[PDB]
Design a protein around this ligand. Structure first.
Ligand SMILES: Nc1nc2c(ncn2[C@@H]2O[C@H](COP(=O)(O)OP(=O)(O)OP(=O)(O)O)[C@@H](O)[C@H]2O)c(=O)[nH]1
Ligand SMILES: Nc1nc2c(ncn2[C@@H]2O[C@H](COP(=O)(O)OP(=O)(O)O)[C@@H](O)[C@H]2O)c(=O)[nH]1
Ligand SMILES: CCOc1ccc(-c2cn(C)nc2-c2cc(OC)c(OC)c(OC)c2)cc1
Ligand SMILES: [Ca+2]
Ligand SMILES: [Ca+2]
Ligand SMILES: [Mg+2]
Ligand SMILES: [Mg+2]
Lengths: 424, 440
């Protein structure tokens, strides 16, 4: 099991996805046209996880670009690393999704979904041993939310035994396109609970506050929000992309991180937070990555308990001092880690650091506090839904009010389920 | 693609179209003969301005638009005037006899003789389109053609184009400018028969445009040319999102997602600033903070009502010109504390923002000063129901005595159609009342 197939859905999906590929191509020494111009053999030793090798020794990403309008995917092609993606893997409709789940899932997206899966199959067929799939998308809009969750269901039908990861940008009024986002998010969450093994909850509320408060950016763009995401995305995928001895796959992570199948909603963190000259000591990275300020999902981890943690330190450092520091926060704050899962924090180290920093730390937490994020969207949903506000946009595409009442209830059970183990 | 076909119906529509299309040509650097020097793709193109203009192989940029009126005098001035070369002759459609301030003549008697021809001519524009988005309909509430023929057309377009979007720019009547005695009847009749078929409708109170021209441009007795040149700037602010490239440009359909909480609640309050004379604007630069604050001064509304004695369901700010996110955000923060903005308990209280960089132009020898920045606020306030109230009262005063109803019955209408319409308006007033009430 080596190969991962990547899909990126809609505006946000394709935007953060582009940056993920820009970031990791740089770490692997792969230039904008697809040729390798690095130095180490360690850059190429697990390049087959995210790249196909082409004629004339070009490296092309195993990446499929999906949208219901040509806007964003045109910008990706014009953008800095656009010439590397296989042009056949640009699959786009024309009419758009209008920030409407129904359009993405049931009508406009239904028309395009088969043509997307053909390319998925095309990239899968030439995988020595396909391990799984990862999707970048948002739950607030139409395409990424609706069509993204449809593709997830189609991919599961056709490849029911592979791993399905998502990097899912959860919405927020602080960084809002449209009032209907909580509807879209809530319909998507119900899908993700069934059809994904891991879902990385990127919350736009959190990314804003990190950009605003802890980076001193007064007026942050989506660009500033996506820097944080593409750094985090490089961080969690480090151990797949590099050697070694203590090397990794998706399924073992999914197994060890997810004690109950519906509870697979992780809370990312990164340290230090960038947009520097003093390198951080190991005790600082450990303090920072566990800080609520560094979390990408706007939840206070003190309001719940960790079921499992996974931590990935990058850089040349004392593995003695990492162990010692990781054992310090566990032994000094043991009330916030469940007692009934022994040794539930796993640490890995990787010698290659990311562009800019001499040593970093990425944090993956399956905390019960993540219920707060779903409670927030569940409140935003009901304020509107209790007056059937804005439903005409969805019922016009064939949707029923029953489907909304279901998706509401499924997510309120998810919050109950997370609350259950926060007390036990 | 994402093409947009404009239909201008009756005098008001036609005359506002002249204003609008003159303005669009000045904004895109299009000449009166139709040539665009800056357009390098000869014959066609996939540019943002192509949503409103098709191209011929010779290089003529032709409005995606139809002009209809049941009498020739108003369209004949387009046919002989400055922009006569801009339109193909078949985009300009006339009869010989008008609807005579009678919805019945516009909708049935004179109207049925030309409806097929119009839909045939709209269809020829629709087949030039690779991905038609919808129609913009320009008309008066008061006129016989403006009310009657519009309604007929709107019904027929719903048949031929299904649910494909149809926006209205309606001219709400007022006694300062020309009015007739029967305009309340035509207003209620068309508002009733169009309500199912329109997706969104921007009402423009002529009194509001009248007071603004008097107060802000210092025009003693404003003419239609004065009112229409102001209106067309508001029309341009709303359509700017469809006609221009932009990083921070939000499309008009995205604003509509927020502006329309229920299908019948599709009447946004337009508010625009700055409207200022060249005399006053000299050595006077109006900041983002100043123009944004002007949007909440109700003397700048397209419709007379009081948002301060109602409730918000949506607030959108469409900036054009020298504007950046930072200042807008500062300006909104200022307003949130100092001003009377209450939202309903079921809507989120954010303001949705769009910005075009292409700065706002003016018609040469106009009354508006050229400014570096501008803004059109589109809000969904319950206060706009006041416009329905004022009009419904006038309807009731005459209908109580059946005054003038014989002119309508003579042309084939029943008394049932009046009461049916009026009860729909009574329901609409009650709907705008119900949405404002707090939840339980
Ligand atoms: N703002 C504005 N209002 C106008 C203009 N022309 C007419 N109106 C208003 O429109 C209403 C009268 O309807 P018109 O559009 O002139 O009549 P019509 O649609 O040609 O209908 P008939 O002539 O009866 O067939 C009145 O309320 C006028 O104040 C104009 O150029 N600008
Ligand atoms: N972090 C981040 N969020 C985004 C970006 N673009 C859109 N969003 C968010 O995603 C939601 C809208 O989804 P979008 O991707 O525009 O719609 P789609 O293209 O139909 O999937 C809203 O909650 C936005 O705040 C981006 O570049 N970065
Ligand atoms: C709560 C314990 O969580 C764990 C324990 C072990 C593993 C694991 C086992 N293998 C063979 N590989 C991993 C692993 C660990 C990671 O964390 C440092 C990974 O980074 C996210 C990883 O990437 C896929 C694999 C996993 C979780
Ligand atoms: Ca279709
Ligand atoms: Ca062109
Ligand atoms: Mg969007
Ligand atoms: Mg006339």
């Amino acid at each position: 099991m080596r190969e991962i197939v990547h899909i990126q859905a809609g505006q946000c999906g394709n935007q953060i996805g582009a940056k993920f590929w820009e970031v990791i191509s740089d770490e692997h020494g792969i230039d904008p046209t697809g040729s390798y111009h690095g130095d180490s053999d360690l850059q190429l030793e697990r390049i087959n996880v995210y790249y196909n090798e082409a004629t004339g020794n070009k490296y092309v990403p195993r990446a499929i670009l999906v949208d219901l309008e040509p806007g964003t995917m045109d910008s990706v092609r014009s953008g800095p690393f656009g010439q590397i993606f296989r042009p056949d893997n640009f699959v786009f409709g024309q009419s758009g999704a209008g920030n409407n789940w129904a359009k993405g899932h049931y009508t406009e997206g239904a028309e395009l979904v088969d043509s997307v899966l053909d390319v998925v199959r095309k990239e899968s067929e030439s995988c020595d041993c396909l391990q799984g799939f990862q999707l970048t998308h948002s739950l607030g809009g139409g395409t990424g939310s609706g069509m993204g969750t449809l593709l997830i269901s189609k991919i599961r039908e056709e490849y029911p035994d592979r791993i399905m990861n998502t990097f899912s940008v959860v919405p927020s009024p602080k960084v809002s396109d449209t009032v209907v986002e909580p509807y879209n998010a809530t319909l998507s969450v119900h899908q993700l609970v069934e059809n994904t093994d891991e879902t990385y909850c990127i919350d736009n509320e959190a990314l804003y506050d990190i950009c605003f408060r802890t980076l001193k950016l007064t007026t942050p763009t989506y660009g500033d929000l996506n820097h944080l995401v593409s750094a985090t995305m490089s961080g969690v995928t480090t151990c797949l992309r590099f050697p070694g001895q203590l090397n990794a796959d998706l399924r073992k992570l999914a197994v060890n991180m997810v004690p109950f199948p519906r509870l697979h909603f992780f809370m990312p963190g990164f340290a230090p937070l960038t947009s520097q000259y003093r390198a951080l000591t190991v005790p600082e990275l450990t303090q920072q990555m566990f800080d609520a300020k560094n979390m990408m999902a706007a939840c206070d981890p003190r309001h719940g308990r960790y079921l499992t943690v996974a931590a990935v330190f990058r850089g040349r450092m004392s593995m003695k001092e990492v162990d010692e520091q990781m054992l310090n926060v566990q032994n000094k704050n043991s009330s916030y880690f469940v007692e009934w899962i022994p040794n539930n924090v796993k640490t890995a180290v990787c010698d290659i650091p990311p562009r800019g920093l001499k040593m970093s730390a990425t944090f993956i937490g399956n905390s019960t506090a993540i219920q707060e994020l779903f409670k927030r969207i569940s409140e935003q949903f009901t304020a509107m839904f209790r007056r059937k506000a804005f439903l005409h946009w969805y019922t016009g595409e064939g949707m029923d009010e029953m489907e909304f009442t279901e998706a509401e209830s499924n997510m309120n059970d998810l919050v109950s389920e997370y609350q259950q183990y926060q007390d036990a | 693609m994402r093409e947009c076909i404009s239909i201008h119906v009756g005098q008001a529509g036609v005359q506002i179209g002249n204003a609008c299309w003159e303005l669009y040509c000045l904004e895109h650097g299009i000449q009166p003969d139709g040539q665009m020097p800056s357009d390098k793709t000869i014959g066609g193109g996939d540019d943002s301005f192509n949503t409103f203009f098709s191209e011929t192989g010779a290089g003529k940029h032709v409005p995606r638009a139809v002009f209809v009126d049941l009498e020739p005098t108003v369209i004949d001035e387009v046919r002989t005037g400055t922009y006569r070369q801009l339109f193909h002759p078949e985009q300009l459609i006339t009869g010989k006899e008008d609807a005579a301030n009678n919805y019945a003549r516009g909708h049935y008697t004179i109207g049925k003789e030309i409806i097929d021809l119009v839909l045939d001519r709209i269809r020829k524009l629709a087949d030039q389109c690779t991905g038609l988005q919808g129609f913009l309909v320009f008309h008066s509430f008061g006129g016989g053609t403006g009310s009657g023929f519009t309604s007929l057309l709107m019904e027929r377009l719903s048949v031929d184009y299904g649910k494909k979007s149809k926006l209205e720019f309606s001219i709400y009547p007022a006694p300062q400018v020309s009015t007739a005695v029967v305009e309340p009847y035509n207003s209620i009749l068309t508002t009733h028969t169009t309500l199912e078929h329109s997706d969104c409708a921007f009402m423009v109170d002529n009194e509001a445009i009248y007071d603004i021209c008097r107060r802000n441009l210092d025009i003693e007795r404003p003419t239609y040319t004065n009112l229409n040149r102001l209106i067309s700037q508001i029309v341009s602010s709303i359509t700017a999102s469809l006609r221009f490239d932009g990083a921070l440009n939000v499309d008009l359909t995205e604003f509509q997602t927020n502006l329309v909480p229920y299908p019948r609640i599709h009447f946004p309050l337009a508010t625009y600033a700055p409207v200022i004379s060249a005399e006053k604007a000299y050595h006077e630069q109006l900041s983002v903070a100043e123009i944004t604050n002007a949007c909440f001064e109700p003397a700048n509304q397209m419709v007379k009502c009081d948002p301060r004695h109602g409730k918000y369901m949506a607030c959108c700010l469409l900036y054009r010109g020298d504007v950046v996110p930072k200042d807008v955000n500062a300006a909104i923060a200022t307003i949130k504390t100092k001003r009377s903005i209450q939202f309903v308990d079921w809507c989120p209280t954010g303001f949705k923002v769009g910005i075009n960089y292409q700065p706002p132009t003016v018609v040469p020898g106009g009354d508006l000063a050229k400014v570096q920045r501008a803004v059109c606020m589109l809000s969904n306030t319950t206060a706009i129901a006041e416009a329905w109230a004022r009009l419904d009262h006038k309807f009731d005063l005459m209908y109580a005595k059946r005054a003038f109803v014989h002119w309508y019955v003579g042309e084939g209408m029943e008394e049932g159609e009046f009461s049916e319409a009026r009860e729909d308006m009574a329901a609409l007033e009650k709907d705008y009342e119900e949405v404002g009430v707090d939840s339980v």
